[PDB]
Amino acid sequence: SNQEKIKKRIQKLKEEFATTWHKDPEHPYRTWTYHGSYEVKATGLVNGVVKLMSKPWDAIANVTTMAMTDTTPFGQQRVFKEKVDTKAPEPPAGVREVLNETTNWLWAHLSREKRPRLCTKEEFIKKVNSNAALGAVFAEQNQWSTAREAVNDPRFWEMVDEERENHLRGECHTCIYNMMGKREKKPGEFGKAKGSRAIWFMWLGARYLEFEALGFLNEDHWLSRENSGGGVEGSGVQKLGYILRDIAGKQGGKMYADDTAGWDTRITRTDLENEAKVLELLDGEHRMLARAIIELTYRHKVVKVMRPAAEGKTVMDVISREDQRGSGQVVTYALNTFTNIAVQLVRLMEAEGVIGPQHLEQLPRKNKIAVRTWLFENGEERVTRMAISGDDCVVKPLDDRFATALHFLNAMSKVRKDIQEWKPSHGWHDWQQVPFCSNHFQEIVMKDGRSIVVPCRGQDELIGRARISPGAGWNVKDTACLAKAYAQMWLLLYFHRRDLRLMANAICSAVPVDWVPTGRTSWSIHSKGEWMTTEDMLQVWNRVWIEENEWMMDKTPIASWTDVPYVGKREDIWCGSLIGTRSRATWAENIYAAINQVRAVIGKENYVDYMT
């Protein structure tokens, strides 16, 4: 019967590629049913402006060696084997009973005020025509070039409608996963560095349907701090410091921020079941559509991934399994956030003595009671002791027993990264040490007495990323506008870093004052892009850090950059600054040559001297 639910998708595939379809180089797959293969053409970039404005960093390996993705069949195969051909064991009965109660409570709290609703075509279109259906990677719309043209084409919507009737009928024909490649390991301190991950694509239509049925969780902000207490969905990275500093303001133990080692490979069928409880919030047609997404696309999956063969030849494998995620779903972040809140609530209950190692296998009735009673009595408060964004977590428990509350965690397969399995976690007394969404956060004193909580992250990573140009069809102009997007990002979020302040200015001096930044500087749901503008960045800085800063009680505007603070030198150096260095001194002193060489490549335009 699993065979039954993937039939139509396999069949559509054997048909379309009946030509080259064969069954089996001796395939690698261990935990995925293998159906067959066919021949395909395989699949498989420096920002001159940024490069030119950052000569010292030519000498830094973290920067020069940086690559984002590996789209080759080789990389597809490696990431699949290391992160997808894997199976997390299901938690024991006692643990299942605890997650059951815990997720019942969380669903009821998240739906206390908000009502589910279908998302719409015109809504999807609105989303597509802008700054993307980000992360939920689109790119299969190949009867059209782009998503913009596809959603404008009446025939596209007929495709959607047709599959929509199949779902309303209980079948999926087109909703198929394609593993495009691997996002490379990202940098970070032991226990926070992100491992490699899979990049999933689906037909644009399968994304619409998913978005129609379940997108409400994102569009109506179910995981906003206001709705969920623990979540931070909707906030920009510039808000997260402040939220952490508020959590730190509460009475309790040290602050914890344990990562799970490969969170997406560690979601269980139990977790999916508890997530699938959304269905019970929906009615009529809405629930029918959602039930199909959950059952036919989330649960009975079909996957295409490339593999190297024979004579510099590559095949596409077709495989299936009843599974869960890795992302590639419209609601991956929202459901990761949900499950992670649940996970942390269970950890807190162990830390607080409500449940023990004795309860893993079987949950005594008395304990079932104490669980429901604790959630009811405490859930609303404990949730505010958390900052949860996807698999990222920060939690401040009542006391440091939390450090040893590990039995339920490990039994849930939510094994922590880079620490021995039963070694107590490390917590920090100082909230400014705590890592969260690739940053930490520092409180700094501005010249005028007032203070701000700003985000800091390894500077090499930032320069490295700005140096990368995604283009092939990125212009001189597009290249300069991308460089400008990065520079202005740094001015809004990392102005407190000397080298970046200096490098943002020089980039901005070097690109026409009237060119609008384009492209994207971050994939993070927390990267809001107030820097995608031609508005003077001081004004934008004032708006973010003073005017709209709800932790800023005095609204007195900052008047010049010379009044906008830097971290202390010690910090700047800790996070990768090159100040106090011969090459960076030389660089600061010759900058103008680089700025001029850029103005002279781009040519005669309106420029502005921001180095004053």
Ligand SMILES: Nc1nc2c(ncn2[C@@H]2O[C@H](COP(=O)(O)OP(=O)(O)OP(=O)(O)O)[C@@H](O)[C@H]2O)c(=O)[nH]1
């Ligand atoms: N578990 C999981 N997390 C993801 C996935 N995609 C993005 N993220 C999260 O998004 C956060 C931001 O980093 P990425 O999305 O990897 O890349 P990025 O955000 O463009 O890089 P930054 O500008 O440093 O934030 C990461 O810390 C991830 O935890 C995913 O598919 N699965």
Ligand SMILES: [Zn+2]
């Ligand atoms: Zn389908």
Ligand SMILES: [Zn+2]
């Ligand atoms: Zn720092």
